[PDB]
Amino acid sequence: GNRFIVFVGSLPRDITAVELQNHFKNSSPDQIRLRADKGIAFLEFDADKDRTGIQRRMDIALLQHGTLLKEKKINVELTVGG
């Protein structure tokens, strides 16, 4: 309902939660679940936490689309509404 999810993928085989937390630290996610099985993860963000702040939190997370992580390039897209 009052939350959105970030589809992050293409992650390295050796990925660590430390490297996930430090990336999205500024965007402040609610949920963090890494699935190395497909090199993807799920990051929920509580929209109810801030009606006018959830936007920037998503922007900051979305800006990581194509960033480099542990010598791999990763993707970031929306997941909820398609």
Curated annotation (Swiss-Prot):
Residues 4-81 form the RRM domain. It is found in: Nucleus, Nucleolus. Predicted to be involved in rRNA processing. Belongs to the RRM NOP6 family. Present with 8970 molecules/cell in log phase SD medium. This is Nucleolar protein 6. It comes from Saccharomyces cerevisiae (strain ATCC 204508 / S288c). The chain holds residues 75 to 156 of 225 of the full protein.
